[PDB]
């Protein structure tokens with residue numbers, strides 16, 4: 001189609017009731033996916049202490065084209081997607097959970113959105129999990145990236161090769177994240193299909209979600 005659409009405020013919650021929760025996690029689904037889908041990762045990820053928020057994308061897609069299309073071709077849908085993630089973060093903080101106890105988890109299109117949001121808005125977060133994603137745009141626009149991660153643990157993975165996410169863009173993303181003071185774990189899985197492997201799940205559970 002095109003990028004001339006809005007993500008309306010569709011937010012699905014699960015996990016610990018937010019008023020009781022010590023921590024929260026913002027979970028971002030992939031292209032053609034759903035909030036209910038992505039939440040089911042709580043069955044294998046150590047999220048049992050988190051209030052879970054998963055916004056649902058309009059058209060089940062955050063933005064219409066490859067994350068590496070000229071960024072204007074993904075606008076205004078992308079800005080709308082970033083706005084919605086920001087609304088979710090704002091809601092969590094208003095429920096009394098500070099950003100340093102807020103975690104992010106995304107797969108594929110959702111991992112790209114996760115990285116793009118957190119890097120435009122870098123501060124001390126609980127942790128950031130980007131399963132097969134990179135920062136967004138044909139050209140990286142460094143001028144959009146502001147803040148300091150204050151050693152936020154970040155896990156970023158991809159497969160090699162992967163026709164959706166070149167290894168080069170994951171490397172570039174790592175370089176930018178490290179420059180902004182994230183504590184970055186990058187893992188590239190040669191020959192892995194476009195998926196979340198069991199190894200990634202265990203690794204995230206023993207590190208970011210320790």
Ligand code: NA
Nearest residue numbers: 207208209210
């Ligand atoms: Na943790």
